[PDB]
Amino acid sequence: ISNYINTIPVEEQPEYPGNLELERRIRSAIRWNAIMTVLRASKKDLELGGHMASFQSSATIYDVCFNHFFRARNEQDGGDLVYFQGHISPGVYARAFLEGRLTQEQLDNFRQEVHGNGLSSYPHPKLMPEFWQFPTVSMGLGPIGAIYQAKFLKYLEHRGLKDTSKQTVYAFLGDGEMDAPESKGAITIATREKLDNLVFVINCNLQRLDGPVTGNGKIINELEGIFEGAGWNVIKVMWGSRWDELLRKDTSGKLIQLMNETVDGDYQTFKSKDGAYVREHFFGKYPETAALVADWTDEQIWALNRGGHDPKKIYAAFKKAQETKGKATVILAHTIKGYGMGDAAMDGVRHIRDRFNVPVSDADIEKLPYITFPEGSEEHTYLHAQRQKLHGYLPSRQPNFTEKLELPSLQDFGALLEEQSKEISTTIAFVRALNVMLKNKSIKDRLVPIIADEARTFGMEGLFRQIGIYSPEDEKGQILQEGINELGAGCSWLAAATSYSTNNLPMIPFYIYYSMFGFQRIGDLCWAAGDQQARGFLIGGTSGRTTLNGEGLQHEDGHSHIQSLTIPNCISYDPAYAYEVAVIMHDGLERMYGEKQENVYYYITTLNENYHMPAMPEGAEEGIRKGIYKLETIEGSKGKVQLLGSGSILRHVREAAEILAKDYGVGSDVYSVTSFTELARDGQDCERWNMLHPLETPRVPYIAQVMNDAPAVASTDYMKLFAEQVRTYVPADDYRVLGTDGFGRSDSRENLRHHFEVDASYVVVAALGELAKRGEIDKKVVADAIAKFNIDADKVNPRLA
Amino acid sequence: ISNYINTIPVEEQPEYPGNLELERRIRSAIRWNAIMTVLRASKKDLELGGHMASFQSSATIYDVCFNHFFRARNEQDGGDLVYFQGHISPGVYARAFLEGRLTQEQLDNFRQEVHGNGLSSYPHPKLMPEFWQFPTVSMGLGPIGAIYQAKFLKYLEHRGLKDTSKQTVYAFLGDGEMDAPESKGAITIATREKLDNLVFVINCNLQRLDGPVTGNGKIINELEGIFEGAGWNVIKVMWGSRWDELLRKDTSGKLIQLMNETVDGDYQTFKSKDGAYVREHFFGKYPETAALVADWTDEQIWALNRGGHDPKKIYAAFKKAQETKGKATVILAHTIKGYGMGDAAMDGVRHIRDRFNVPVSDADIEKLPYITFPEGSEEHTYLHAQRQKLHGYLPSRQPNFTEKLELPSLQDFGALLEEQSKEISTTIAFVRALNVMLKNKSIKDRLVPIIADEARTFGMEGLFRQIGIYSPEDEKGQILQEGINELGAGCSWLAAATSYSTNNLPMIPFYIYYSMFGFQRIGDLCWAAGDQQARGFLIGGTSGRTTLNGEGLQHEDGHSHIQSLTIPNCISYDPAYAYEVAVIMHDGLERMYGEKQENVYYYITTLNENYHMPAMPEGAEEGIRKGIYKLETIEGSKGKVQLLGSGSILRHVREAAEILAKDYGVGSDVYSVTSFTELARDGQDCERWNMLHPLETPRVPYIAQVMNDAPAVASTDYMKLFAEQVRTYVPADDYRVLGTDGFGRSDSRENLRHHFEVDASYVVVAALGELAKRGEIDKKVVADAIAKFNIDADKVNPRLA
Ligand SMILES: Cc1ncc(C[n+]2csc(CCOP(=O)(O)OP(=O)(O)O)c2C)c(N)n1
Ligand SMILES: Cc1ncc(C[n+]2csc(CCOP(=O)(O)OP(=O)(O)O)c2C)c(N)n1
Ligand SMILES: [Mg+2]
Ligand SMILES: [Mg+2]
């Protein structure tokens, strides 16, 4: 680390280009409206919430940026991409209001958006589709999301898809937020990728929410040390302009020594006392430092401020960051939390009114009025002139992309709809589907294949020589290889899946990884992706509890689908055949990037197990998209059942169908369930609608339009709940579900499918059991089947194993 | 960053204390047996998998540790806590086999454990309770887990609970793994806490899985840079002993320069060529770097090895790490990937046998035999001699603690079982329950409250005064304040929740945080916690989609219970009342830390909403623990329904019962469901048993014993699936579920409960709907209820809003 002073000395500091006095009047009005918005919300006494102290500490930092740096979306590019610190939203709304982009009625509806004309608590594009762009309130995601957004912008330029050289990514972070592993865990990537189009602005007010970040330490030195060691350009903005005289005349170096040795805890104590106290405990530590302010009054000493509140020091930092190349820059802005709010941090708000010279009658304070600048006023003119120079207003968002893509038709995937020559897997099918898309002139170069180190495990080796690996294996490479870093790969996926909005340049990402390390490991990011309206594909490879048989407990995924169904705009599928993978990918491509432009993303689990891939049944396309279709009906005069399967288990369910017919004379209807989740949601929607329209023609759940009423059995490679979720909509009185509940373990696929009780043997027993209960066959038959199949009726429940 | 040479120069290198020749004979046998184990598995052609190259590159590092450093569990402490790199498992098994702790039959069942006498693919305590200790295969979790384990050990010492001063925590990592954000994301914490009982060992073989970590750079320099920047003591083990005389002879320092300028890509090139290619491209880079290897034969040059393969260099690194104080130490060990395997990473087997002078004859080689050292042999004597001087063998694990605790009885929670004067929340009930435990002599000091910055939000501040905050507010503080770091807090919780096994010292942790940032954010650690047999409590505060009303989309949790039900050994509850909280916590304590010592952990969601807390009905104990109990029955002659509710929504379900009786003469049975998940699991266990015992009387799900067959409606603050999961077990033919599917948004609780269609008015309408559908009432009564309650029948579906 370096001395606890500004990185940029006054001598190298550029002249401030703006009208400081005018900007302060405008800024004071914004601080005011921000506070009023939150206080009005508090007055309603509805537990609405909202913060004020945070924006107060960073208001000047943002003000300098809005006046001289942030470029808004324009005809050439999406402008600067600003990841606003989540809880300072009231400050963004206040400025928007003054710019005339929001009404008073909207500020009055802060945190009350159910009725349509309110404002979200935090930046949520899903709720405010034309205003916010990036979800940042979940601490940690913003910084890593920003790093990969910056890398993605360079990717677009290097690929020759769009000149993004005029765009900068700004990430506004708190110092307490930096403790989240995601916040610093990927800062080395910025150095590897030379992201000089990235700027981290860390508001260092030395405090978390409940207390100091490191009371007996110096968080600023800690941050400087690690970012410096990571190869970043660190710019510290420590002290305001009043300190310049002091640091300049102290030829003893004692003041610096004092600033260096004083810890975060003591600095916080000062900002709760007064001038006299600072003179005694701070400057009074050494005779040399005591002499520097001897001729100063207590008031003059109390005026000394931290750098993050001085427009001149702030400007210098951002300007230098804008000139730095070959690496990312992080600005450490020293501020005071609860700035100008007094001890606090009706009438008690007249303190801030006087502190910031707010032009509001001390008679109207009770009314908590909003301040506005009339058209023609000096303030109004200035406010708009500075923004026009920067191409308009920010934040803003375009919900749809403008261009028309010529997507491939289902027929282009024709080869995958036919019976396959060799035994392949759904993952191999996925790769072949990707190849078809890579032949489409319209979207071939808009495709963004993303992988988490493991590429050989997914047979992606072929695409390598074909489209190359992005490596600024060169700068024209198309595939993003992020190594052992699912969160990083996920953030790359997110930047690509939202490029249609951010840069009005639709890109179509396909991120394939070990399904177990999907939602379970980066679920918080998947939730934010939905909020950000991500349109892309998440491919969970090596999925299924019993399919990735040798890997064991931390790799065998039998629940990612349970996690994915919790995300509203995520459409999940678990196909068993190659032709289903084709119809699904094609449909998803059409829904998200076709004229419909549906705001959803897809999650498709694929397998690493090879088996026979039959041809798609004529007319099954729509059923595949809806979640279920009938594969075949097998004759049998001793009984009749329904058998459902998905993923790798479907082949075993079909095996059971044959066993039931040839050994027991039991006939059956076999169905391939491509999506239990979409069928469950369709059913929930139908039942909701019918309940609200009791007098009208009821809607029938899709699954009830496919299945009949004979006893049913379902088996999958996931936990029982995956198939049980449609119980309510299944038109049969008997519905037994087999699943892989329990921790995985290492063994052969055969042994695991027997252990998890989902193989053909268990399907037969479950089906016979249902028939026996209906008196259609003797219970002894079921008991003998259990014996014949060597089933241990008394082994421990797999869930407890 | 320092020069690309060893940190410890030969002049400061301690004398190696062991028999190099003999240790190598032992090591070669371990290398051989590890390889045989994987090869034999492969021959089965069951896609079992397993690695070899990784252990080959790091065997010498682990060998030095086993011979001179690793302390085994003993009478004083749990010994050294080693987080073994998961993929080197075959090497640990090979050694255990040689030490006579594993049989040949077990080795032959490598990756085949369904039948009971096999070995897990990776370290999984759940699968091998007396062998493995820490789950490490999920990349990234190992390093952050180890940091907090080391922190926890200091805590135990500072709190006077146990002297852990002789324990060292070792985390063995791969360089590719360091890319995981969690790997380096928390390293500054080790510095803040001066964790001199922690050692990171990074195997830098320059390659991850599908290529190098950073071919165009120097991964070792990147790692040194960020770890040095984070305040760690970095020890680089770059070159073997053969280089010493050379480097010493080097006067122009040109050799140093040569090494510094060469990047990972180059080094991996020489790593494949030959002794001649090296004197040309490497030593032939500069004239001065030629005279050094002039009097050297191509064979002598090709002999130059990397430091990670030199026991003398490795020993010096660990010795220095062992003596270092004030901070953590990281050892960067330079090795060769697929070391000694030449061919790959029968001729192949013969090759390795000759390379390591393995004592296997040509006549036995095709049998892929394991090697053993008979008692009395030199190897057998030394192997066991070294371990005995180090207190025994490891890894080893003790599944149950020996001590007997005197747990508080339910009566000790008496005040919580009675009606409350003041309106409070389930979170307030939780804090009071904790205070009761803090008055119990036997466990008061064993409790470990854990928080992530936010404390006042959960009303915990009342405790900070009593037990204090751990801060080496002092070293005796009992509460762990981890700041904005859910993952870090989760790791501290894990270290404490498994202390009963690791240090034979049961500790009872309670980690409270915003439920949204629970499984969704650290789900991979929660899965690992179940594998590690964690026993403790996870408290999801501010839960429920409509209850954390002002925060919005990324805070409103209506799905954490869907994520938690995927973890086999996690018991989940969503209580509505304070007495339910008391009963649940008491039972959890008894089960996990009483005589039963059950290996499960608890997840309990609590609320921030205050309301009337009634008294616990007499005899409701069993029901509360099971998941459901009948609260009351309300008379009605025009019909009868069953109403189920949980969490904050129960209050509204009871309100609906009143309206149904008063306004429509419809009576009902009202139930409080404390856990839909335990109920669903119970139901699944019964149906499974019934399916497997067709000749026996069907067992009845507990929920079916409590409920009757009248139409039922269920409503919760979570998505519909949470209540729908018990559909198959509910005795009624009609079961309607209301839930909070869809993205959250900001507003009053009233508007959100109406928006998500879960409030009183919707429960009433759902109930009436089932009655009308059955014929008990006219449809028009439903249509008018919808009008009367001002319900918008055409409002968009909340899941889509
Ligand atoms: C993952 C996550 N955990 C916790 C919170 C709750 N939270 C909101 S603000 C805050 C503290 C912010 O501190 P800091 O980052 O230092 O910013 P400041 O407000 O001081 O500028 C916390 C913990 C959150 N939003 N996300
Ligand atoms: C979270 C997670 N992602 C991916 C994997 C798959 N994986 C297994 S080994 C490996 C690479 C190992 O490379 P490194 O850490 O450098 O160690 P080495 O084996 O080379 O010694 C990967 C990505 C995993 N186990 N966990
Ligand atoms: Mg802060
Ligand atoms: Mg490696």
Side-chain angles (χ1 to χ4, degrees), chain A residues 51 54 57 85 87 122 137-140 173-178 203 205 207-209 213 337 524, chain B residues 452-454 484 486 514 517 521 555:
Chain A
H51 313 71
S54 186
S57 70
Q85 185 166 43
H87 50 292
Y122 306 117
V137 63
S138 181
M139 312 271 90
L173 317 163
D175 51 25
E177 163 173 35
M178 302 311 292
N203 182 23
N205 47 34
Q207 186 187 304
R208 300 196 302 278
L209 190 159
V213 180
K337 194 160 188 176
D524 207 39
Chain B
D453 184 39
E454 282 249 306
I484 310 174
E486 277 74 37
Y514 279 83
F517 311 128
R521 194 179 176 80
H555 285 79

Coordinates of all heavy atoms in Angstrom, one line a residue, chain A residues 51 54 57 85 87 122 137-140 173-178 203 205 207-209 213 337 524, chain B residues 452-454 484 486 514 517 521 555, ligand 1:
Chain A
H51 N -33.6 3.7 2.3 CA -32.4 4.3 2.9 C -32.2 5.7 2.4 O -32.6 6.2 1.4 CB -31.2 3.4 2.5 CG -31.4 2.0 2.7 ND1 -32.2 1.2 1.8 CD2 -30.9 1.1 3.5 CE1 -32.1 0.0 2.2 NE2 -31.4 -0.2 3.2
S54 N -26.9 6.3 2.9 CA -26.0 5.9 1.8 C -25.9 6.8 0.7 O -24.7 7.2 0.2 CB -26.4 4.5 1.3 OG -25.4 4.0 0.4
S57 N -23.9 9.9 1.4 CA -22.4 9.8 1.4 C -21.8 9.8 0.0 O -20.7 10.1 -0.2 CB -22.0 8.6 2.2 OG -22.3 7.4 1.5
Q85 N -25.3 1.4 -7.2 CA -25.4 0.7 -6.0 C -26.9 0.7 -5.6 O -27.6 1.7 -5.6 CB -24.6 1.5 -4.9 CG -24.5 0.9 -3.5 CD -23.5 1.6 -2.7 OE1 -23.4 2.8 -2.6 NE2 -22.7 0.8 -2.0
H87 N -29.1 0.4 -3.0 CA -29.9 1.2 -2.1 C -29.8 2.7 -2.2 O -30.3 3.4 -1.3 CB -29.5 0.8 -0.6 CG -28.0 0.7 -0.4 ND1 -27.2 -0.3 -0.9 CD2 -27.2 1.5 0.4 CE1 -26.0 -0.1 -0.5 NE2 -26.0 1.0 0.3
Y122 N -35.5 -1.0 -5.5 CA -34.2 -1.1 -6.0 C -34.2 -1.3 -7.6 O -35.3 -1.4 -8.2 CB -33.5 -2.3 -5.4 CG -33.5 -2.3 -3.9 CD1 -34.1 -3.3 -3.1 CD2 -32.9 -1.3 -3.2 CE1 -34.2 -3.2 -1.7 CE2 -32.9 -1.2 -1.8 CZ -33.5 -2.2 -1.1 OH -33.5 -2.1 0.3
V137 N -28.8 -5.0 -6.0 CA -29.0 -5.1 -4.5 C -28.5 -6.3 -3.9 O -28.3 -6.3 -2.7 CB -30.5 -4.8 -4.2 CG1 -31.3 -5.9 -4.7 CG2 -30.7 -4.7 -2.7
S138 N -28.4 -7.4 -4.6 CA -27.9 -8.6 -4.0 C -26.4 -8.4 -4.0 O -25.7 -8.6 -5.0 CB -28.3 -9.9 -4.8 OG -27.7 -11.0 -4.1
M139 N -25.8 -7.9 -2.8 CA -24.4 -7.7 -2.7 C -23.5 -8.7 -3.3 O -23.8 -9.9 -3.2 CB -24.0 -7.6 -1.2 CG -24.9 -6.7 -0.3 SD -24.5 -5.0 -0.2 CE -25.4 -4.3 -1.6
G140 N -22.5 -8.2 -4.0 CA -21.5 -9.2 -4.6 C -21.7 -9.4 -6.1 O -20.8 -9.5 -6.9
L173 N -19.8 0.3 -5.8 CA -19.8 -0.6 -4.7 C -19.6 0.0 -3.4 O -19.0 1.1 -3.3 CB -18.7 -1.7 -4.9 CG -18.5 -2.2 -6.4 CD1 -17.2 -2.8 -6.6 CD2 -19.7 -3.1 -6.7
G174 N -20.0 -0.7 -2.3 CA -19.8 -0.2 -1.0 C -18.6 -0.9 -0.5 O -18.2 -1.9 -1.0
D175 N -18.0 -0.4 0.6 CA -16.8 -1.1 1.1 C -17.1 -2.3 1.9 O -16.4 -3.3 1.9 CB -15.9 -0.1 1.9 CG -16.7 0.6 3.0 OD1 -17.7 0.1 3.4 OD2 -16.2 1.7 3.5
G176 N -18.3 -2.3 2.5 CA -18.8 -3.4 3.3 C -19.1 -4.6 2.3 O -18.9 -5.8 2.7
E177 N -19.6 -4.2 1.2 CA -20.0 -5.2 0.1 C -18.8 -6.0 -0.4 O -18.9 -7.1 -0.9 CB -20.7 -4.5 -1.0 CG -20.7 -5.3 -2.4 CD -21.6 -4.6 -3.4 OE1 -21.6 -3.3 -3.5 OE2 -22.2 -5.3 -4.2
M178 N -17.6 -5.4 -0.3 CA -16.3 -6.0 -0.8 C -16.0 -7.3 0.0 O -15.1 -8.0 -0.4 CB -15.2 -5.0 -0.7 CG -15.4 -3.8 -1.6 SD -16.0 -4.2 -3.2 CE -14.5 -4.9 -3.9
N203 N -17.2 3.2 -2.6 CA -17.6 4.2 -1.7 C -17.1 3.7 -0.3 O -17.7 2.9 0.3 CB -19.1 4.4 -1.6 CG -19.5 5.5 -0.6 OD1 -18.7 6.4 -0.3 ND2 -20.7 5.5 -0.2
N205 N -16.9 4.6 3.1 CA -17.3 5.4 4.2 C -16.9 4.7 5.5 O -17.3 5.2 6.6 CB -18.8 5.7 4.2 CG -19.7 4.5 3.9 OD1 -19.3 3.4 4.4 ND2 -20.8 4.6 3.2
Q207 N -17.9 2.1 6.9 CA -18.9 1.4 7.6 C -19.9 0.5 6.8 O -20.2 0.8 5.7 CB -19.8 2.4 8.4 CG -20.8 1.8 9.3 CD -21.8 2.8 9.9 OE1 -21.4 3.8 10.5 NE2 -23.1 2.6 9.7
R208 N -20.2 -0.6 7.4 CA -21.2 -1.6 6.8 C -22.5 -1.0 7.1 O -22.7 0.2 7.0 CB -21.1 -3.0 7.5 CG -19.7 -3.6 7.4 CD -19.8 -5.1 7.7 NE -20.4 -5.4 9.0 CZ -19.7 -5.3 10.2 NH1 -18.4 -5.1 10.1 NH2 -20.3 -5.5 11.3
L209 N -23.5 -1.8 7.6 CA -24.8 -1.3 7.9 C -24.9 -1.3 9.4 O -25.5 -0.3 10.0 CB -25.9 -2.2 7.3 CG -27.3 -1.7 7.4 CD1 -28.2 -2.4 6.4 CD2 -27.9 -1.9 8.8
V213 N -16.4 -1.6 8.8 CA -16.0 -2.8 8.1 C -14.9 -3.5 8.8 O -14.8 -4.7 8.9 CB -15.6 -2.4 6.7 CG1 -15.2 -3.7 5.9 CG2 -16.7 -1.7 5.9
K337 N -20.6 8.5 6.0 CA -22.0 8.0 6.0 C -22.9 8.9 6.8 O -22.5 9.3 7.9 CB -22.0 6.5 6.5 CG -23.3 5.8 6.1 CD -23.2 4.3 6.2 CE -24.4 3.6 5.7 NZ -24.2 2.1 5.7
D524 N -28.3 -17.4 -7.1 CA -28.6 -16.0 -6.9 C -28.5 -15.2 -8.2 O -29.2 -14.3 -8.5 CB -27.6 -15.4 -5.8 CG -28.2 -14.2 -5.1 OD1 -29.4 -14.3 -4.7 OD2 -27.5 -13.3 -4.8
Chain B
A452 N -24.6 -12.0 9.7 CA -23.9 -11.5 8.6 C -24.3 -10.0 8.5 O -25.1 -9.5 7.7 CB -24.4 -12.1 7.3
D453 N -23.6 -9.2 9.4 CA -23.8 -7.8 9.5 C -25.1 -7.4 10.1 O -25.2 -7.0 11.3 CB -23.6 -7.1 8.1 CG -23.7 -5.6 8.2 OD1 -23.1 -5.0 9.2 OD2 -24.3 -4.9 7.3
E454 N -26.2 -7.6 9.4 CA -27.5 -7.3 9.8 C -27.8 -8.0 11.1 O -27.9 -9.2 11.2 CB -28.6 -7.6 8.8 CG -28.6 -6.5 7.7 CD -29.9 -5.7 7.7 OE1 -31.0 -6.3 7.7 OE2 -29.9 -4.5 7.7
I484 N -21.0 -8.6 5.6 CA -21.8 -8.9 4.4 C -21.0 -10.1 3.7 O -20.4 -9.9 2.7 CB -21.8 -7.7 3.4 CG1 -22.3 -6.5 4.2 CG2 -22.8 -8.0 2.3 CD1 -22.3 -5.2 3.4
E486 N -22.5 -13.9 3.4 CA -23.3 -15.1 3.7 C -22.5 -16.4 3.6 O -22.7 -17.3 4.4 CB -24.5 -15.2 2.8 CG -25.7 -14.4 3.2 CD -25.5 -12.9 2.9 OE1 -24.9 -12.5 1.9 OE2 -26.0 -12.1 3.8
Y514 N -31.0 -13.0 6.1 CA -32.2 -12.9 5.2 C -32.4 -14.2 4.5 O -31.5 -14.6 3.7 CB -32.0 -11.8 4.2 CG -32.3 -10.4 4.7 CD1 -31.2 -9.7 5.4 CD2 -33.5 -9.7 4.5 CE1 -31.4 -8.4 5.8 CE2 -33.7 -8.4 5.0 CZ -32.7 -7.8 5.7 OH -32.9 -6.5 6.1
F517 N -31.2 -14.8 0.9 CA -29.7 -15.0 0.7 C -29.2 -16.3 1.4 O -28.0 -16.4 1.8 CB -29.0 -13.8 1.2 CG -29.5 -12.5 0.7 CD1 -29.9 -11.5 1.6 CD2 -29.8 -12.3 -0.7 CE1 -30.4 -10.3 1.1 CE2 -30.3 -11.1 -1.2 CZ -30.6 -10.1 -0.3
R521 N -28.2 -18.5 -2.4 CA -26.9 -17.9 -2.5 C -25.7 -18.9 -2.2 O -24.7 -18.8 -2.8 CB -26.8 -16.6 -1.7 CG -25.6 -15.8 -2.0 CD -25.5 -14.5 -1.2 NE -24.3 -13.8 -1.5 CZ -24.1 -13.0 -2.5 NH1 -25.1 -12.9 -3.4 NH2 -22.9 -12.4 -2.7
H555 N -35.4 -9.7 -2.7 CA -35.4 -9.9 -1.2 C -36.6 -10.8 -0.8 O -36.5 -11.5 0.2 CB -35.5 -8.6 -0.5 CG -34.3 -7.8 -0.4 ND1 -33.8 -7.0 -1.4 CD2 -33.4 -7.6 0.6 CE1 -32.7 -6.4 -1.0 NE2 -32.4 -6.8 0.2
Ligands
LIG1 C1 -26.4 -10.5 -0.3 C2 -26.9 -9.4 0.6 N1 -26.8 -9.5 1.9 C3 -27.2 -8.6 2.8 C4 -27.9 -7.5 2.3 C5 -28.5 -6.4 3.2 N2 -27.8 -5.1 3.2 C6 -28.3 -4.0 2.6 S1 -27.4 -2.6 2.7 C7 -26.2 -3.5 3.6 C8 -24.9 -2.8 4.0 C9 -24.3 -2.0 2.9 O1 -23.0 -1.6 3.3 P1 -21.9 -1.1 2.3 O2 -21.7 -2.0 1.2 O3 -20.7 -0.7 3.1 O4 -22.5 0.3 1.7 P2 -23.0 1.7 2.3 O5 -24.4 1.7 2.4 O6 -22.2 2.0 3.5 O7 -22.6 2.7 1.2 C10 -26.5 -4.8 3.8 C11 -25.8 -5.9 4.5 C12 -28.1 -7.4 0.8 N3 -28.7 -6.4 0.2 N4 -27.6 -8.4 0.0

